[PDB]
Scaffold this active site. Structure first.
Site, PDB file in Angstrom:
ATOM      1  CG  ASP A 140     -73.961 -37.005  28.435  1.00 54.10           C
ATOM      2  OD1 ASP A 140     -73.093 -37.136  29.070  1.00 54.10           O
ATOM      3  OD2 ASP A 140     -74.818 -37.960  27.929  1.00 54.10           O
ATOM      4  CE  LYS A 143     -61.800 -38.481  30.067  1.00 55.19           C
ATOM      5  NZ  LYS A 143     -60.491 -38.145  29.510  1.00 55.19           N
ATOM      6  CG  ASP A 168     -74.811 -36.500  32.490  1.00 57.80           C
ATOM      7  OD1 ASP A 168     -74.813 -36.595  33.769  1.00 57.80           O
ATOM      8  OD2 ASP A 168     -75.214 -37.484  31.619  1.00 57.80           O
ATOM      9  CG  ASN A 169     -71.618 -38.474  32.550  1.00 55.52           C
ATOM     10  OD1 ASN A 169     -72.282 -38.457  31.455  1.00 55.52           O
ATOM     11  ND2 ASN A 169     -71.976 -39.310  33.415  1.00 55.52           N
ATOM     12  CD  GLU A 198     -79.130 -48.917  39.170  1.00 50.73           C
ATOM     13  OE1 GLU A 198     -79.431 -50.160  39.153  1.00 50.73           O
ATOM     14  OE2 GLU A 198     -80.334 -48.308  38.684  1.00 50.73           O
TER      15      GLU A 198
END
Ligand SMILES: [K+]
Length: 218
Positions: A140, A143, A168-169, A198
């Site tokens: 995490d 990237k 993640d991501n 969100e």
């Protein structure tokens, strides 16, 4: 201006209950939701993290990246007595908030925060931090380091058959080269999990990639 992470810690210290990790997580998510900080609302991805920890019961976990400590609290609260979470983070100020967050949660003894770049620290795990092989890795951090650091973990002998990588991501902003590598490699068995963000109202995701052992020398 105050950083997001220092404001998150302020809110936790004033609203959560000491030694109550669930209350800490809920306070972080409540505050970040109010501020509309989409990448810092962790409950959706936390459901997936929890299920992985519950299924595999890792004794030694490597976490790459820390911001305010949400993920460290999330994982450490489910680890057994005697288990160890190693958390690498290059920004000392984030490492500092993460440490304070763990202390408030009462989980500090399970975690060792290593302040430095993952690519520098990973080759030190064997000899300096007395690691054999990792049971789980949570990716995490930056990237563009997901794939290189995976290859580095492999080369340093830190993965064994059965080691679980959870990234993640992987969709937003994305780690497409990492995904293509693990999905295409016979050394990893992969599963994808959708995780909603969100405000951007988009389905991000996590990838679980279980190491199978190295490729043949043939
Ligand atoms: K594969």
């Amino acid at each position: 201006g105050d950083t997001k992470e220092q404001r998150i810690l302020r809110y936790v210290q004033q609203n959560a209950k000491p030694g109550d990790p669930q209350s800490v997580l809920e306070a972080i998510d409540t505050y970040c939701t109010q501020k509309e900080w989409a990448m810092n609302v962790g409950d959706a991805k936390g459901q997936i993290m929890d299920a992985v920890i519950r299924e595999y019961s890792p004794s030694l976990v490597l976490e790459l990246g820390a911001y305010c400590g949400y993920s460290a609290v999330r994982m450490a609260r489910l680890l057994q007595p005697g288990a160890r979470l190693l958390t690498m983070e290059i920004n000392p100020d984030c490492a500092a908030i993460t440490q304070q967050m763990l202390n408030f949660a009462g989980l500090q003894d399970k975690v060792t925060i290593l302040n430095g770049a993952s690519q520098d620290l990973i080759p030190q795990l064997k000899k300096k931090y007395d690691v054999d092989t990792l049971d789980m890795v949570f990716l995490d951090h930056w990237k563009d380091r997901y794939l290189p650091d995976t290859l580095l973990l492999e080369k340093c002998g830190l993965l064994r058959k059965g080691t679980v990588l959870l990234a993640d991501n992987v969709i937003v902003p994305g780690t497409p080269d990492f995904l293509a590598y693990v999905r295409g490699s016979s050394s990893f068995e992969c599963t994808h999990y959708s995780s909603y963000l969100e405000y951007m109202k988009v389905v991000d995701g996590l990838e679980k990639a279980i190491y199978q052992g190295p490729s043949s020398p043939d």
